[model samples]
Target: STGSATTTPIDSLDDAYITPVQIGTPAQTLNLDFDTGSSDLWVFSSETTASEVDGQTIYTPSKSTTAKLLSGATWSISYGDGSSSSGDVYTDTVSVGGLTVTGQAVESAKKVSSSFTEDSTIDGLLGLAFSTLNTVSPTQQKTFFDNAKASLDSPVFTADLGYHAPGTYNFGFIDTTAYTGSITYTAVSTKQGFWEWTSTGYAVGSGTFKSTSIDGIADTGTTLLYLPATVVSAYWAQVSGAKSSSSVGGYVFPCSATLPSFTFGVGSARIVIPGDYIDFGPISTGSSSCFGGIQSSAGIGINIFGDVALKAAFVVFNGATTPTLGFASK
Candidate 1:
């Protein structure tokens, strides 16, 4: 059963997109963040202390007759932002879009970080990254895509993330109607369990494109675009009155600043991020100061092409042999 899923942005956060996923025999549905940066399908569940759950939906294993505990098994994961979750494991039927996979390992969270517990809208995370990144202990678990790949017509998924709008996550196929122009392909190195690739270089405004080979990961879970310090500095320098704010923890500029276009190199194809998109909204409520959508990935060790950069392009996460990435203008 080959299929695709349309994910919608929950609330006005626009930081992540969610889709309905069914778990267990009776099909208890949950709104999950389909994160491409990590590999673990976990959810808030009965195992969590009621007080810690807050307003997030919880998965009840006892309600599903087909749910079976994975004896002596546990799973734990921590994110770069320090958010984390961990819990016991269970094997059950899991379905995404119209495709279903039986005996899929679903991690039920017993403990979640403050960041997660406070997010009332998100029930859990549906990891779309490679299965090698699964957090299951004793035995690594496969992701929903991995389990369903053999049945799919093509081992590919497209992420059409929008800026403060709804988008679709297509699986097993690509919708030619979703994008225009030719799709440029770039080789991906999954050694780090991420869609890591080397960008030929980038340019600020209409300036000459640099030829620096920068390695970075395409992360949907991250909200901002993080580039090498040098690159970030160069981009911000072009904007008058842009400065690094310690209190804001990144670069901020006057809301009236006329930002220039930023572009990244993927082979011979140039993906351009519009000037307005770089504003990234205001820094605070009722404040004229705005934070930059592009920042330095200084301490992180690797650059991250987060939602700010991703929403500007139609991305193809190709899972075929020698997994590659395809990009096209929206």
Candidate 2:
């Protein structure tokens, strides 16, 4: 298996992104948060709770040497913006960008939430979806691209996010110069262990394609882009003083509202999305209105393409052997 390739270095602080694994044995690096929508590669350790350690970076498996625990294991998660964590499990010797994965597992985090002890620049989460959506119970665990996808070299993985600079997460291969046409595949329904799909419709502003399919999940750990409330209320009723916000809920406007471009169809392309990424800024800082990265999944009853439609595409989480998802448009 001429596999085991790697690459990690995620950045984008204004909207938070991270990745820099390496663990156990004189290594000890952390910086996680690589979520492709929940899988459970958990962290922030020494078993958390020092009154819930505020500024992240923990991982103390009694100072490694390949750490080991997993006895009577345990784990828990919960996110969909509800923030959560759990604890115990341990195996060690992970690494990234140079690919390593001896024993892996890890978990640890004896409890957390204050929206994850107030995110001091992530130090936990490297999910990458589908370890059957692991949440480690009677010993469930496997991610680091699922124990390095049997020494990869193909079982794919890709993401090139960054609407303000910084993106890279390749694993195995597929850096066709990061994208620019021909990659509209689909069909990924791991029965909801997510990486799910179904889009084929939606357009707003110059609007026309509303074939209405939608059912989503491309979640690079959500940064907003949900839909279905009749295509997010026909895209905030065409901006211009947007509206609706049950006291700070969804729509808002006048950060100069002139937006439009939103497309979204998939299998025949048409991905679009610009309107300055749906003006998701200035909620109340001096109130010039502004808010929306496209919301309304009816308060998350599923349907989310997160990272604002993955920062305008080039996705690919392809895990072969029946898994598929392509998307390209960089």
RMSD of each: 1.4, 14.9
**Model 2 per-residue lDDT tens digits across residues 1-330:** 222222233433235567677898999988887888888888888778888888888999988988899899899888877778898889988877777889888889899888777777788888888888798889788888878887878878788776766677777787888789678888889887888889889789786787867878898877778888878788888876787788987777878667787888886677888878777677866778888888788877888888877878888888988988898889
What does candidate 1 score on TM? 0.96
lDDT of each: 0.88, 0.80
List, residue by residue over 1-330, the lDDT tens digit for candidate 1.
Answer: 566777787656466778888998799998899888899999999998777798887789999999999999899999989899999999999988788889999999999999888888889998988899999999999998888888888988888888778888878888889888989999999998999988899999999999999899988878889998899999999998999988998999999899999999889989899887787668888788988989999978889988878888889999998899999987
TM value for model 2: 0.36
User: How high is the lDDT of residue 30 in model 1?
Assistant: 89
**lDDT for position 132 in model 1:** 93
Say which candidate scores most in TM-score: 1
In candidate 1, how many clashes are counted? 0
